[PDB]
């Protein structure tokens, strides 16, 4: 859209996840800085009434705040002058089977906002776990249109958030990835009719590729590889679902994203490269045609997933010419930096010096260099593989500082083991499986199970780290940087912390009711800056706490690595808002009282 850019330039609004089409999480407000960071105290709080994980950040547009919860995916609207009153709420009635299929994961990403033209009003776009997509009025809260996208019987359940580009809404797919492949769909935002669909694996007609696909880099793979890499008709169960974030560039009219991992998990049953799975894509918004694609890990064996966040910037390269760049972290431990006009490889580096799954990434060819000692092979003790299945990076949304040209990231510190096994049975039957263990890395301690995460500042071109800091538990949710020389982030211990953007000294810390797996947001209402954050624990780190599991092997070793989380936090869910000196709407106590 063109209205959304102007809305995002203002400091009173937070319109889309990432706050921009560049996905920066950067704010130009400098009311809160290093001088007066000690005086931050809460202004108000709100409770949603559910016990699961709460992800994403709330949206603030035109003096209202919109809050979304986990299953069963409720929605609330609040007014910033009188936060006590709820303007409207949406509580859906879903099919009972929906919880049965996907009881393991009950979370959601966020909401979408469309300003609307003169004829049609502004819209809030949301998705449900049952597999439905709905549009609601912003002021009142009725339903304008509702469509069905996925099928529960196959096993596909929705967790993603929609993306609004021009007059279109873009929706991916997610689910159990057992016997179905992934696809991307574009709908009209006013009516709900389907414009275009794209597939990850299959023939060229289903891929919907362009005429100049990968013209600049022909060695990345050009044509016919959707079915050539796979053996037989395996691509009908290949997988490749995407549940990450998006980026959009008005100048080139492209949307950038990345695809998921292939299926089944047994690397023996799917020989080949499995092309266009774990691939960075840039697709046209109007027609859906792909302009370039780049594959990261051919023939994945460690059950990773390349569905992390994309970021955009404009910087000078080593030669000394200005270039437009996209940066992508990945779970395998490699950060990629590409050109978002053709797709040329500019940089590829390692997040930490304790990566053993790969030795280096070749820039000329793009093929990673593998170390076979840390691979997965049958009848062997694959020990001390760094990272684990969780990976160094995960679903959080990192931050970028345009003035300092620095990326602020939160990186896991976990290393795993792997042991296959085969068990025979009565009449020509056998079971093949693998057992996994997870433990902290070298920089922490393994006896007490502490030191599972760190926070870093990174430079894309040169590759240096300005500072490095450790944490008790893994950072999960993302960071938010401000122009007052501050970086804010939340911790699974139930803390919100602010650090200096130059050296990294800790300046302010507060105790929230429960842990946070989202990212903070900032805004201003009337000459006053407010910082809001969710609280609630769930997902992989909280599986043992949520479902009351005590077996180390349960949850693919998540319970064992996070066995000490129950000594610091409990369950909950809600939102908390901070401001300087606690100044807020209810400074005059007579406001909002019955009369």
């Amino acid at each position: 859209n063109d209205k959304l850019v102007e809305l995002s330039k203002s400091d009173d609004n937070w319109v889309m996840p990432g706050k921009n089409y560049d996905s920066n999480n950067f704010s130009d407000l400098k009311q809160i800085n290093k001088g007066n960071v000690k005086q931050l105290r809460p202004a108000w709080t709100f409770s949603t009434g559910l016990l699961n994980g709460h992800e994403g950040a709330p949206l603030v547009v035109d003096g209202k705040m919109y809050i979304h919860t986990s299953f069963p995916n409720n929605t609330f609207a609040l007014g910033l002058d009188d936060p006590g009153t709820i303007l409207w709420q949406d509580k859906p009635k879903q099919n009972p089977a929906a919880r049965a299929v996907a009881c393991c994961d009950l979370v959601n990403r966020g909401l979408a906002y469309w300003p609307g033209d003169g004829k049609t009003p502004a819209l809030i776009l949301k998705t449900q776990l049952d597999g439905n997509v709905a549009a609601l009025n912003a002021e009142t809260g009725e339903t304008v249109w509702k469509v069905e996208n996925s099928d529960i019987k196959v096993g596909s359940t929705l967790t993603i958030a929609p993306y609004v580009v021009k007059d279109k809404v873009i929706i991916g797919s997610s689910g159990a990835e057992l016997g179905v492949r992934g696809y991307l769909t574009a709908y009209d935002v006013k009516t709900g009719e389907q414009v275009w669909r794209a597939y990850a694996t299959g023939p060229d007609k289903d891929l919907l590729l362009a005429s100049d696909f990968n013209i600049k880099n022909p060695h990345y793979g050009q044509k016919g590889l959707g079915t050539g890499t796979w053996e037989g008709d395996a691509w009908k169960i290949g997988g490749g679902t995407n549940w990450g974030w998006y980026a959009y560039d008005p100048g080139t009219n492209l949307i950038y994203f990345g695809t998921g991992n292939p299926a089944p998990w047994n690397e023996t049953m799917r020989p080949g490269d499995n092309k266009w799975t774990m691939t960075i894509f840039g697709r046209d918004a109007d027609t859906g045609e792909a302009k370039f694609g780049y594959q990261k890990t051919p023939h994945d064996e460690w059950d990773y997933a390349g569905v992390n966040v994309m970021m955009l910037s404009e910087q000078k390269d080593k030669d000394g010419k200005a270039r437009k760049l996209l940066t992508h972290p990945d779970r395998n431990g490699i950060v990629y930096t590409l050109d978002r006009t053709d797709g040329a490889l500019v940089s590829a580096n390692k997040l930490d010096d304790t990566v053993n799954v790969f030795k280096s990434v070749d820039l000329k060819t793009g093929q990673p260099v593998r170390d076979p000692e840390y691979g997965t092979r049958m009848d062997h003790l694959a020990k001390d593989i760094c990272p684990s299945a969780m990976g160094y990076h995960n679903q959080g949304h990192d931050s970028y500082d345009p003035k300092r040209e620095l990326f602020f990231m939160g990186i896991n510190h976990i290393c795993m083991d792997w042991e296959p096994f085969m068990l025979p049975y009565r009449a020509g039957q056998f079971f093949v499986g693998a057992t996994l263990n997870m433990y902290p890395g070298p920089k922490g301690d393994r006896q007490n199970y502490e030191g599972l995460g760190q926070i870093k500042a990174y430079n894309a071109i040169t590759g240096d780290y300005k500072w490095e800091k450790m944490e008790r538990f893994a950072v999960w949710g993302g960071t938010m940087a401000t122009a007052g020389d501050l970086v804010f982030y939340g911790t699974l211990d139930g803390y919100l912390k602010a650090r200096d953007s130059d050296t990294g000294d800790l300046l302010w810390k507060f105790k929230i009711p429960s842990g946070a797996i989202g990212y903070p947001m900032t805004y201003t209402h009337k000459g006053t800056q407010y910082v809001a954050i969710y609280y609630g624990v769930g997902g992989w780190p909280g599986v043992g706490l949520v479902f009351d599991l005590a077996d180390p092997t349960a949850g693919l070793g998540a319970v064992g690595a996070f066995k000490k989380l129950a000594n610091y936090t409990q369950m909950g869910g809600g939102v908390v808002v901070f401001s300087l000196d606690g100044k807020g709407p209810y400074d005059d106590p007579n406001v909002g009282e019955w009369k």
């Binding site: 057992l178 016997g179 068990l423 039957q429 057992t435």
Partner: protein, 249 residues
Amino acid sequence: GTLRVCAAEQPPLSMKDGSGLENRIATTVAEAMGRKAQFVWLGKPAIYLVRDGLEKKTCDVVIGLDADDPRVLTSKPYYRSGYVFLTRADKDLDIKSWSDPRLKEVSHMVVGFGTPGEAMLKDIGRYEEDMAYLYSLVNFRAPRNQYTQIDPARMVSEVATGKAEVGVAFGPDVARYVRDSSTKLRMTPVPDDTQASDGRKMPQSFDQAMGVRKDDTALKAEIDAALEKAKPKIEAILKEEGVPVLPVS
């Protein structure tokens, strides 16, 4: 003087109430030896019965295992069995082999996990059409660490309802449920001369013998000397249960 048997929750083989085939066939042999049987209960399913139950010095003998099994010693086998087809009556759908072209046109079929039927579906190129259905018969929860399998009653229920047309199942697991089914179902033994596309043979019949520890030779002597004493009783119980029995060697 009591006999310890390794038992686990696995219908319709072993249950707490003792109405299963396993419990009855154990009690008959225990009475034949004159020594009462003791049931050691282990929570994990039957596939874990040996490694966690026999070499841990908890129970003495396991009741059902394949003949000439390598890891544990096998006694004299006492009955035959095999995989059988499962369809409806009066549907004019009779299947006598795995090369019948009608198998490529049915809507759906139900088979187990890690079984010769699954490999045969791989061979004739049909796994892609049915993988979602098989993972939907149980809830979509198949972790690598734990062992998951479709309940035998579920297969018979699905064939009776009409969701699947042709099923393949092991005899003893479904013998009780087929003869109690409301709709008259039909069985058929699977031929032993079944060949894959590559050519490797896929056996469809197996022997059933008791399994003891490596060093318990005297208990082996007692077991294989008491088996012929109560053979008519075992045969009568097996015929009453409705299990198809193939001729022994």
